[PDB]
Amino acid sequence: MFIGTIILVLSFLGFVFNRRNIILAFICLETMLLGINLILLRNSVLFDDISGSLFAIVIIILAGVESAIGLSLLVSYYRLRGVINSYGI
Amino acid sequence: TFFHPKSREDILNEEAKIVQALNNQRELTIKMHELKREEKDYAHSYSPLFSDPVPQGGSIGKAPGSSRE
Amino acid sequence: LPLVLISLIVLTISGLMIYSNDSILINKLLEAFGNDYNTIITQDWFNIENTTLLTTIGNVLLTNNAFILLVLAIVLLLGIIGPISITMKHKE
Amino acid sequence: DPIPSGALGQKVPHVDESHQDLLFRTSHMVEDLETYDEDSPINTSDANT
Amino acid sequence: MLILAIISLITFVSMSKLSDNRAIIRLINIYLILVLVLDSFLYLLFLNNQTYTVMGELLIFNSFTFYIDMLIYFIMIVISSLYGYNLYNNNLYKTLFEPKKELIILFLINILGALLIVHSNDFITLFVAIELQSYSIYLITAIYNSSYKASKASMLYFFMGGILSILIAYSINTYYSVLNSYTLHSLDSLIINTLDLNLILIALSLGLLFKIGIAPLHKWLISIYENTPILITIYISLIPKISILSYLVLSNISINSLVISILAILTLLVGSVGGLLQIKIKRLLAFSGLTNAGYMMLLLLLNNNEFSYLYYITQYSISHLAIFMIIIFSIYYINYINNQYNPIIYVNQLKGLIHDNAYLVLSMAIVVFSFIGIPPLLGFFGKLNILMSILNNGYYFISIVLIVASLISALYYLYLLNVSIQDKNNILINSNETVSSVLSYILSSLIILITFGFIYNSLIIDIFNVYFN
Amino acid sequence: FHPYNTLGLATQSAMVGLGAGVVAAAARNSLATGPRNILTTFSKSGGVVTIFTGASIAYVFTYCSAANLRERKDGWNHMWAGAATGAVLGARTKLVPAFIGWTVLCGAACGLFGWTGARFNADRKASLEQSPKGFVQEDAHQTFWEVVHRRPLSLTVEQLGEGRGINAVPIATATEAPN
Amino acid sequence: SSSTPLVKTSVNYSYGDYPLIDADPHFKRVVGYMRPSDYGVIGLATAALPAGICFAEWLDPVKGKFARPSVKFLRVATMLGFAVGFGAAYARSSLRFFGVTENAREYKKDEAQMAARKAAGLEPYGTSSLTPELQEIAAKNSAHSIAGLFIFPWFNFVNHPYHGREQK
Amino acid sequence: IAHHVDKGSLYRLGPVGINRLLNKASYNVINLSSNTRSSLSMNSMLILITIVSLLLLVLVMNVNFIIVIPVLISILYILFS
Amino acid sequence: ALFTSLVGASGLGFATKFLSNKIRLKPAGYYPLGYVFSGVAWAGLGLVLHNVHQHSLEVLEKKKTAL
Ligand SMILES: CCCCCCCCCCCCCCCCCC(=O)OC[C@H](COP(=O)(O)OCCN)OC(=O)CCCCCCCCCCCCCCCCC
Ligand SMILES: CCCCCCCCCCCCCCCCCC(=O)OC[C@H](COP(=O)(O)OCCN)OC(=O)CCCCCCCCCCCCCCCCC
């Protein structure tokens, strides 16, 4: 409950206050999902329940597919522009 | 002579019939506003077939002593 | 820095107060900071099999929640089919 | 007579091929009243060729 | 039926060249029509609001969801005819509006994600379906990768939609941490009063609502609808809003929220005010979609909101298609083409359209006055029902803000009509090319419904008083 | 009614308005264009701090004061508070007429906001849905939302007043012949 | 192997104005009880889809000139049209079972089928390969799934005992 | 009368004044997402501001509601001035 | 009534065909058979709503009868 909230908050703040590049944005998204899964698995242990672990495995699947789609979209941007500059999207 | 109006009586009856039907629609409207926002049954709301809300859980380590009422 | 600090404090205290059901605000956080007491672990004898978490996940995911599995298949179809459409130019 | 006006009576720019030039890039008008295309066939003529 | 469509199309499209894409779109168009005709009798199951739970307790099927399903299909048989029937058989209109190979698959997958949301009964199905609807619509924005603006658009929409999926999952995991449940049926008057879940559920509503452009995070979605191609803008702008608003209406989460009241007020003000200086069409119509999202947000606070929502979402969708269709037809009669993807950008390019095609402007006026809420057009009977519900439940300041927002929005809605009925030199006198038959008949049918569908209002009320009561 | 505490609420309101000024200052320093730093927050900010503090002070001070002077709780108080707030905000533009206009129109809007109940929410029990409605049954007092076929005459004479055609007894029966 | 319910259900719930037969009918009974109206609707959709694209090509051809669509699209057209027709007929029969439409002939056929099975000693609705808990899970997954026919197809194949009739 | 009222204050409380009022308010609404240099960090900062503002606004209006009102008047000024 | 409904729904259908012809900048009498097709199609739609409403009125009447 602590570690997950902390990674989530710090990664949201590093997503919001990133004036540098974009890979930090991808990373902060993945870390936010990680912290969520840790919150949920801690609660699932304390309750001795399974719905939490089910939603966790589902998050892992969905996050991996998220990164796949995001890194195809980036490749499209790069196709057209040739450089992913610090302040472009 | 060419003045051939409908009588007073037939006019009053027709207006009364109209007002009666309008009052009928009024009562139907109130009655439906009441029929909605009235509590229903679980079967009409969630599940006609498995109408027992009570959740039976897993079975792989069913512990006698875990049922309760 | 000022916005980073304000956002840090508020988001942390809210993310901690949120998990509790007390009505007074300050007590919602002082409940989160109550990690003081140990949890007893008793041993029973009702579990008969060698079911672990992965077996349970398979059982519920493939019986009770089959629909989500048969939708994740389509999420993965998107993971295949979108990146192709984006990267691969079907000029022919 | 015709000078293009807006929903509020404000002045509006008449868009042509005139201001897709390289002179009107690198300005900081908002996304609403910018008028630079970036995808016109005047700028994207030599495009990944 | 969607699934067998999506499954069959994958094989049938991989087996098929780039030259069959229009015919394949036409096929799935007719197939969806046959579904909507032949399987529509299933509305009988929902007599007396008999509600069904399916796949355990993951899905829920009632008259609300079924009507939304028919509407999404009616939208998806009109949005497909726009890709599968060429307007004019000219080289320009071949280059301007040509479908890609994978587009139709992504449309149907987005239909599926839309329907899994409204039909959801558990948060797990919601999270899986909103990710499906979200990922499919990242790709739809990005499929036209030969444009710079669309590339920028998909990237921003990915990041700012990912952030909101994080917010949604954080809210769900909090609800589960509190209550050990993923199902909202496990709430009731006792549990609402007894537990402090207000924060935990508004965070759900906001994480869903900021994905549809609710203020003050409207700008990013407006930049997207402007920067993307027009025939994609007409889909992305509508279907995601229907799905998420319908899920939030069906689940009576935010009965009397103060935060929602504030934000909905801000949407009506922003979407009415900020759209006045706009010279571009798509930003104008996006701010219009925002203020209508404000009006429809105002019935998340009611607990009896089905009729008002269903009537407004239907006329909104119809007017939204019809106006974008008028803008598409008018490309023939303008003088300057701005792009291969957005041939028409500025409102001042529709000048003199009355002197070219007048009945296109008649349709534009009917549709505009429908947006404004002029009777006897359907928009009146839709905004009337909203006013009845909010005044019946105790929102008065918001009704005044609603009236004020309608007046302010008349101005950016009438900008189109004013420039259209203006005069122009170099008029059209003859043209041997002719627009397609189907797209004309579709536009006409939407116009005739916006105009004359007030005739059936009692009949709709009777059917509603049976199947929804 | 129960009186208001003017200074207690005003001090809370001022600290709140100062805090909101700090938040908006930092948010502007982050969202702004040109080279900035941690110094610019309170230098280059367009009076967000004094805006928020003066408004919250003037609004709450005037509402509690006029609630205590009028000795009531109603919408006229919120009108006076919006009138003060419009003065403060319009003093920034250094013109008399815009100051008067900002005052009157901010006052009318807050005064309407107090008329409708001084809330963006709803009461949810004073509303028509959750309250008695329709025709009252048998001679019972007519509430707000209730409808009546025939009203008492004493209640009419009190709510309206006598004269201008409206009287305690009808005119014919009053002038009937005692025969 | 016991085929005895684990969880209570409703007895003779009325989904419509007419009586009930089954609430989760097996695919076999739904296909064997089909009226000719259902097979005609199958062939109606089977012919109406390819005819629909021919009608459309007549209205707005794909090029400048009318040409009849290629047999490739016609074949795929016929397959999907049979699928639409079967889904409609599987629904029309299922609703005759639920009690939403006229179900006289289906009532009598089930009363005859069931009495014959009781005479032969067979379990009504049959015997299964599964444990009863999976039977209940199957009925919970598969009951009233035809309401989702616009989205997905789902079908009962398990021979569970949780049909919505009295114990006998 | 004809000038100072019929064509003066009564156009100011109407077409002329509402036009000027909306000219500014629209030009301040849209000049909010100021820099197009990077649309991402800006909308991201807008998320953080809104979340923080709602958490703090709800905090204030739990304890007292007649104090948050001027906070909202001033916010509307900041957004529309 | 049924017949009044069908003529009206056909009247909307002629308006769709006419408005479609005009949007194409054709004469109103371009392809007359389209008037007949639009008539029967919308007539079927009005007929469907006619039967839906009839079934619903019967249902509420049946509710009163079983009372
Ligand atoms: C997603 C990206 C990943 C990052 C995630 C970051 C963590 C997320 C934090 C939580 C989720 C975000 C919530 C978004 C804001 C909206 C919250 C909300 O609207 O809930 C309001 C709700 C009451 O509203 P309502 O139900 O509508 O009306 C009835 C009122 N009785 O319920 C409430 O009443 C709210 C409860 C009031 C207490 C709020 C807690 C504030 C405490 C902060 C104190 C800070 C200390 C002072 C200042 C420090 C600076 C020096
Ligand atoms: C730290 C110590 C804490 C102490 C405890 C008490 C703290 C209370 C704090 C209260 C909240 C203060 C938040 C202040 C608002 C955020 C500041 C801001 O600048 O908002 C606007 C923001 C940036 O705009 P800016 O860079 O200044 O450029 C202006 C040019 N237009 O751009 C944005 O888009 C963000 C907008 C955020 C809006 C939040 C939601 C407000 C809801 C509007 C209310 C409308 C209701 C009234 C309607 C009446 C109808 C007539």
Ligand SMILES: CCCCCCCCCCCCCCCCCC(=O)OC[C@H](COP(=O)(O)OCCN)OC(=O)CCCCCCCCCCCCCCCCC
């Ligand atoms: C809980 C309480 C909440 C209740 C709401 C309280 C209301 C608070 C309102 C404050 C929020 C900020 C909005 C203020 C308006 C924004 C623009 C402005 O500041 O007004 C000035 C404008 C300037 O006119 P001018 O002097 O000619 O131009 C030079 C300006 N530097 O002025 C003019 O154009 C001339 C004004 C003439 C008077 C016109 C009166 C019209 C009244 C009907 C308004 C209806 C439209 C409402 C618009 C809403 C916009 C937010």
Ligand SMILES: CCCCCCCCCCCC(=O)OC[C@H](COP(=O)(O)OCC[N+](C)(C)C)OC(=O)CCCCCCCCCCC
């Ligand atoms: C449904 C397709 C929508 C696609 C868009 C086309 C509009 C069709 C509206 C018919 C709705 C209905 O007839 O139904 C009435 C519904 C509930 O009835 P139901 O349970 O859904 O049964 C319907 C069974 N059908 C599908 C076989 C017929 O009441 C409502 O709240 C709907 C409010 C909609 C207002 C829009 C009016 C538009 C004018 C229509 C002139 C023909």
Ligand SMILES: CCCCCCCCCCCCO[C@H]1O[C@H](CO)[C@@H](O[C@H]2O[C@@H](CO)[C@H](O)[C@H](O)[C@@H]2O)[C@H](O)[C@H]1O
């Ligand atoms: C411009 C026209 C449209 C503008 C929109 C507003 C129209 C709607 C009317 C607002 C009605 C407000 O009415 C609200 O206050 C009245 C008192 O006056 C209250 O009425 C109640 O007041 C109490 C006294 O406090 C008395 O017992 C009274 O008999 C009644 O029960 C209700 O709690 C509520 O109905």
